[PDB]
């Protein structure tokens, strides 16, 4: 037992990380088959980042201007193209460490592991949620651009995120692996508004079920509620409205613990209205929203990958 | 910027994980060079776990009784020996994925990454501290025994922990890779007392410095204190006494932020005496003690591994 914020094992992704240098700019790229993916702003200088004309900047570049290094291995670039906010560098060698993989666009409230990298070298791994406002709260220093987010299902790596930016507010933005930003963000040095964010209600309830499975049960009460009454509380506390789709996804955890989803909603309502009263739940003094119901079932079941 | 509880990239360790089966018991082993390391209680049945005579149980076993599988690869066992609480299975093939590595015994209050594994297959990675009472608060289901803890310095993996037990209180115990338990624990199914635990003061102060570097500064105050006065507060709140050795280790962070260590101690004293007043620090509503000063400098500096 016990419950921790756990990331996927990073090995299959470590094998794909490279360094991409264009002129004086260095960041990370992802080497899959004979293609290297990286943020398009590798072609910019600090001067350019105000309002870059990426089409004009890339026209100045030839294949031999993109230096790609995997550890000591130098890769030969034989093609380049821009897709949305990413550059695709065709190389003459397929990555021998390419895992089974897909590209996916994740939904807000879904979770993924980030492999933070600098100069193509893995630094660390942590678990993130895509916020309702399409930002992530990561850990990314200058040079982390091109680090990727992913999930693993058995042997298949689903890449969902590439790091592009830190907003002046200190939060993080990036793209899917086709180079489309999550949220309204653009790859330029401007102040950019993120939506007002909300708490991911279905994830808090998943985590409450994780707490009960692990013997933290002090917050269970004598009460129940309705979807309608609960959503009035959710509104007041800036929580996502709970839908029957969310109730359905919580079905397995409700079945395991024997606690009806609306009974767990009545526990959450009391926690929102009264606070934690100086107590903790699974080592936390606030309501945690970065575990999906699938996360909770996986960690409670001991699912593995190859 | 941003600050997350980040684990080491797990790839070098994933390459070393195997399954070890003896009779009907299956758990994880660590394949380094031509030796597989695993918990000795692989040789027990549930019946045996009350008070196992491990010397007598191992005498009944021959090399061919230990089934070792790395993915599909079956390994040939050519020797076995018990060292303290671990079994060392000599195999006829050196692991080709063996990283540069050392075995280390970590000190209480130090941190490490855990690769949780089941049937020799990696499940997830998370960051842990060795508690002052030599327990860890992990996430370990039945079959996780033999999962390992580690740190990485550049290309060298320092193995510090192998998982052996969950205490009836739901906390976790294990050994170094020479098979010596951390703390007073024994590998048998008995109730076993853990020491009274304390909060790792030097780690809380490290994390306060991380908070200031990341722009969380609401807890900084007009006050200072002395080591003596601070330790009176530490006692009352079950924090480790702070020593000059701890002040010295905090020197780099004090230098970066320009906040004297005893000034940061006066912030911590006010936080212990007044609480957080419904506010957060780096996303936490309590005082976090699982980042070492070295952790904070690494994450703030972007150190990488190969
Ligand atoms: C990120 O884009 C990244 O890692 N880019 C490459 C250049 C490392 C990162 C996050 C915004 N950007 C920067 O770190 C960069 C600072 S730097 O050029 O000094 C890199 C340092 C390791 C040497 N900031 C530029 C930037 C802003 C916005 C953006 F979307 C991309 C880059 C800056 F400051 F010019 F605007
Ligand atoms: C752990 O020792 C482990 O993973 N061991 C091997 C057997 C998987 C783990 C934590 C205590 N122990 C158990 O999971 C085990 C339950 S089980 O045999 O049903 C394993 C299950 C996946 C099939 N508990 C035994 C045990 C207690 C204490 C100990 F130190 C080791 C084992 C028990 F219950 F018999 F005591």
Swiss-Prot record, chains A, B:
Sequence ranges on the Cytoplasmic membrane side: 1-306
Position(s), cross-link Glycyl lysine isopeptide (Lys-Gly) (interchain with G-Cter in ubiquitin): 5, 90
Regulation of catalytic or functional activity: Inhibited by pyridone-containing alpha-ketoamides compounds 13a and 13b. In turn, alpha-ketoamide 13b (tert-butyl (1-((S)-1-(((S)-4-(benzylamino)-3,4-dioxo-1-((S)-2-oxopyrrolidin-3-yl)butan-2-yl)amino)-3-cyclopropyl-1-oxopropan-2-yl)-2-oxo-1,2-dihydropyridin-3-yl)carbamate) inhibits SARS-CoV-2 replication in human lung cells. Inhibited ex vivo by michael acceptor inhibitor N3. Inhibited ex vivo by compound 11a and 11b.
Reaction(s) the record says it catalyses: TSAVLQ-|-SGFRK-NH2 and SGVTFQ-|-GKFKK the two peptides corresponding to the two self-cleavage sites of the SARS 3C-like proteinase are the two most reactive peptide substrates. The enzyme exhibits a strong preference for substrates containing Gln at P1 position and Leu at P2 position
Consequence of changing residue 132 to H: In strain: Omicron/BA.1, Omicron/BA.2, Omicron/BA.2.12.1, Omicron/BA.2.75, Omicron/BA.4, Omicron/BA.5, Omicron/BQ.1.1, Omicron/XBB.1.5, Omicron/EG.5.1
Subcellular location: Host cytoplasm; Host Golgi apparatus; Host nucleus
Domain Peptidase C30: 1-306
Active-site residues (renumbered): 41, 145
Role, per record: Cleaves the C-terminus of replicase polyprotein at 11 sites. Recognizes substrates containing the core sequence [ILMVF]-Q-|-[SGACN]. Cleaves and inactivates human TRMT1, preventing tRNA guanine(26)-dimethylation of tRNAs. May cleave human NLRP1 in lung epithelial cells, thereby activating the NLRP1 inflammasome pathway. May cleave human GSDMD, triggering alternative GSDME-mediated epithelial cell death upon activation of the NLRP1 inflammasome, which may enhance the release interleukins 1B, 6, 16 and 18. Also able to bind an ADP-ribose-1''-phosphate (ADRP).
Assembly with partners or alone: 3CL-PRO exists as monomer and homodimer. Only the homodimer shows catalytic activity. Interacts with host FBXO22; this interaction promotes the proteasomal degradation of nsp5.
Name of the protein: 3C-like proteinase nsp5
Native organism taxonomy: Viruses, Riboviria, Orthornavirae, Pisuviricota, Pisoniviricetes
Range of the intact protein held here: 3264 to 3569 of 7096
